Design a protein around this ligand. Structure first.
Ligand SMILES: *C[C@](N)(CCC[C@H](N)C(=O)O)C(=O)O
Ligand SMILES: *C[C@](N)(CCC[C@H](N)C(=O)O)C(=O)O
Lengths: 279, 279
């Protein structure tokens, strides 16, 4: 009886639910796990609810990861949600931007003329207490710091986009055994709320290649918050400029850490795949 | 513009298409690959077409694997198709069994009172030429024969249920590195048309545990033709009786190699997950 629409942003794929009738998400986290199961359910990286606006915003977004946990933001999902909201509003839509309340703060996607969606992702949070991580003291940044993972010491940089990211720079990202090492970062004791983990190969100062092991979702084909965080980490470590393409397994995102307002802007696509109803 | 229903049989999941309007499948193999993609499409192990009957049968089944190739039969998919046909017929249904034309021959599912589907899967095909495989001469069976895969010699038995199977018996099926070794069996030169590969742990003479790397689909949670072939192989090698439970990752199937008619009967569930429409 549940109607939904399947979207993906660069192959990070989501079940979108019109939840305008209530501030309460209409499916539980447990049911979201069942719906995200790729064989027994619909199959997705997460469920996204289009919820009533709060505190002057146009709408609210909540998301459950495919493990049922509730993260604070999602960039690919915000793009999908903006596309979904435009589809719901149809010819009643009177603007090209939505102000969206999230657990991380207000996030503003803009539907651009060429079909892409450009998102004001807010300010990156750089202090260890904001990640959160215990690698450094709460009031310190975490830049090129050591993390021992199964006896091997990695150099990592942590950044939060509302959610935690642990970024490490590598010579050959395709060679990372991501299915094995990803969970060991995700659940490392240094991360009290777990972390997302990005492996970055710098191709040039404006082009990063990324693979990710996501908190609560595993190997995904793209991660918007993670691409933002990785660009921030590349700037902080002197490896990249503030405007770059981040090439993900599912395709490219354009990331800009603006010198005007110090906010991150992320531009990419959103694709509606199919509409469905649960039996 | 394509409407479809998602089903699974023990987690082996399929897109079912009502194709009774024409003998021409509504989608090409290339489009089936796109639709079976888990992140960019609907996500499935295969597309199954409910087609008009041929040569006296009630309906015809064709199936595309998620890689686009067209196999000759599918047991989990026949069960799902029988459930789909019963829904499509609705109150006009006047029988509990359908005779279904397939590339492998006529296959007859029976909707049983308890919600399961029992399928007459036909005679197993035991000669190397019928598999096909080059392990033995075309007129010989293939029972506990050697197969070198990356320099390690496995003992294998081959059986066809219309499609090829290569069965090997192991002490601990959970321990098989299936992602790594599966494709090496699938594409081994001994199999000119590739093969499905089943790893079997005998628990008792009426209980087998199975994991499978499918031709054209990879790691699946269940395979009906493969469970049938594995029971046949277990009988041929003296390891099991002719009636057994085959426990797959997705659940159990009941397999019987009847002594009355030497045909294989397979019983298991079918579950309708959701209906949908491509954007
Ligand atoms: C949607 C996402 N890939 C972030 C999803 C949340 C993370 N899995 C987490 O738990 O923080 C994105 O595109 O940003
Ligand atoms: C549906 C299936 N798992 C068989 C599907 C065909 C094989 N992948 C092949 O290529 O032979 C079943 O349940 O029998």
């Amino acid at each position: 009886a549940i109607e939904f629409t399947k979207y993906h942003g660069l192959g990070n794929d989501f079940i979108l639910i019109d939840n305008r009738a209530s501030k309460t998400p209409a499916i539980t986290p447990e049911k979201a796990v069942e719906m995200c199961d790729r064989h027994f359910g619909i199959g997705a990286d997460g469920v996204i609810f289009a919820l009533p606006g709060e505190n002057g915003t146009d709408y609210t977004m909540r998301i459950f990861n495919s493990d049922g946990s509730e993260p604070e933001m999602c960039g690919n999902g915000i793009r999908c949600l903006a596309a979904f909201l435009a589809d719901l509003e149809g010819l009643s839509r009177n603007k090209d931007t939505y102000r969206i309340h999230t657990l991380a703060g207000v996030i503003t996607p803009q539907l651009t003329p060429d079909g892409q969606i450009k998102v004001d992702m807010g300010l990156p949070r750089l202090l260890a207490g904001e990640i959160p991580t215990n690698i450094a003291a709460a009031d310190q940044k975490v830049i090129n710091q050591p993390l021992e993972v199964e006896g091997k010491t990695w150099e990592v940089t942590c950044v939060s986009m509302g959610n935690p990211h642990c970024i490490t720079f590598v010579e050959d990202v395709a060679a990372i055994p991501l299915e094995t090492i990803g969970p060991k970062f995700e659940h490392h004791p240094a991360f009290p709320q777990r972390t997302n983990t990005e492996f970055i190969q710098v191709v040039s100062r404006d082009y990063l290649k990324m693979r990710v092991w996501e908190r609560g979702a595993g190997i995904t084909l793209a991660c918007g918050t993670g691409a933002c965080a990785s660009l921030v980490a590349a700037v902080l470590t002197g490896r990249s400029d503030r405007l770059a393409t981040v090439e993900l397994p599912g395709g490219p995102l354009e990331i800009e850490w603006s010198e005007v307002d110090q906010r991150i802007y992320m531009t990419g696509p959103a694709d509606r795949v199919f509409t469905g109803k649960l039996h």
